[PDB]
């Protein structure tokens, strides 16, 4: 029951974040942020600081996580260790 | 124009069907009530049947009158929602009220500004010339 509920709510959160990203692309940002790859229930890649005027931000769900907490992954750069900023 | 022709046709059909129906339902009540000779069916059936029939036709007439009232109200709403010339005249009239209000407010504010500015000038000529000298 916990595994099914967790998978469902995490996929719903992925969908909500994807809708928020497309809404931001539509109105305010306007090509200043892009969607590289979006896999429903697997990962969603957002690219900022484009080459015109690249980096990606992947938000994924892994079946069930017990040994390691499931957080977000900044895949391309792997940002440096900034104690205050990387935590936020 | 097509869509205006269709709206007119629908309202007119509502009204025509309506006068015809109220008159015909009254006619059916009178084709009836007329205590005619009975046979075979028997009053025990004829009587109750006739009573029920009269009740139902009365209800029908009342419903047709209610529909007439509804259509009248609809026409009234249409003549206030989008008559067109009256609506244009009303928009022009509200523009008038708003404009006069704005004018009055503007004049008031300008006069206020002038008087306050004169007071400010007096105070600027004072405070600056004060001996004091901490």
């Amino acid at each position: 029951m916990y595994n099914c509920l967790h998978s469902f709510c995490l996929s719903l959160q992925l969908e909500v974040l994807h809708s928020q990203t497309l809404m931001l692309i539509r109105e305010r940002w306007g090509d200043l942020v892009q969607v590289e790859r979006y896999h429903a229930g697997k990962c969603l890649s957002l690219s900022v600081w484009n080459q015109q005027v690249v980096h990606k931000v992947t938000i994924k769900i892994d079946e069930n996580d017990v040994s390691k907490p499931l957080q977000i992954f900044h895949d391309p750069p792997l940002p440096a260790s900034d104690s205050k900023l990387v935590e936020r | 124009p097509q869509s205006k022709e269709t709206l007119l046709q629908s309202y007119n059909k509502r009204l025509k069907d309506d006068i015809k129906s109220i008159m015909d339902n009254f006619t059916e009540i009178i084709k009836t009530a007329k205590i005619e000779d009975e046979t075979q069916v028997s009053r025990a059936t004829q009587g109750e049947q006739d009573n029920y029939e009269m009740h139902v036709r009365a209800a029908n007439i009342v419903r047709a009158g209610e529909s007439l009232m509804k259509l009248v109200s609809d026409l009234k709403q249409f003549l206030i929602l989008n008559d067109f010339p009256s609506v244009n005249e009303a928009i022009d009239q509200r523009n008038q009220q708003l404009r006069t209000l704005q004018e009055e407010c503007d004049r008031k504010l300008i006069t206020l500004r002038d008087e306050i500015s004169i007071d400010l000038y007096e105070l600027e000529e004072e405070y600056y010339s004060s001996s004091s000298s901490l």
Partner: protein
């Protein structure tokens, strides 16, 4: 430059009902106070070796001070499809300085007929509806005295489209349909 085609639908309103049409147009059109323009137009024709004389229409706004004369060329009708239900003509619109009359006469264009048009202008999107009463002008040169060509007023719906894509006529037909009970705006061929 791309060419500018003018889509035109022309219809007439008798004077008695002018008030009803004015109120109606104000409601459907964008909420702008009516223009109430007055203008004088003289058409110049060039009698060259080719039989057809080039016709250039020169317009001066008497009512609006400090506004330039407008010179326009109107092409032959390009109407083809019955579905379009519009008159299509090539049009070039050029604002000109006051010394327009002299330049045209020296060039060789000859003044032919002059009319004075007075009426109201209203607009919805690109569409412009002009309602005006044409007045004949008598005496060789002047605008002081005019006689009415007709009791009725011509109503013309005109769009100066860029000539890119189409369906411009469809929008015009829909708008014309609303005024159709009040006045039948239709494409009337200039011939007879």
């Amino acid at each position: 430059t791309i060419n500018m085609m003018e889509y035109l639908l022309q219809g007439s309103v008798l004077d008695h009902s002018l008030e009803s049409l004015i109120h109606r147009l104000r409601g459907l059109c964008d909420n702008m106070e009516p223009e109430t323009f007055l203008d004088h137009e003289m058409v110049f024709l060039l009698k060259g070796q080719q039989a057809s004389p080039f016709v250039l229409r020169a317009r001066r706004s008497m009512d609006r001070a400090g506004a330039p004369w407008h010179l326009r060329y109107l092409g032959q009708p390009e109407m083809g499809d019955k579905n379009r239900h519009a008159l299509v003509r090539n049009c070039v619109d050029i604002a000109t300085s006051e010394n327009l009359t002299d330049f045209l006469m020296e060039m060789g264009f000859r003044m032919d007929h002059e009319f004075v048009a007075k009426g109201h202008l209203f607009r919805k999107g690109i569409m412009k509806i002009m309602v005006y009463k044409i007045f004949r002008i008598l005496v060789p040169g002047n605008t002081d005295s005019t006689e009415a060509l007709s009791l009725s007023y011509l109503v013309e719906l005109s769009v100066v489209a860029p000539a890119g894509q189409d369906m411009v006529s469809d929008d015009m037909k829909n708008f014309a349909e609303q005024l159709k009970p009040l006045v039948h705006l239709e494409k009337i061929d200039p011939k007879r």
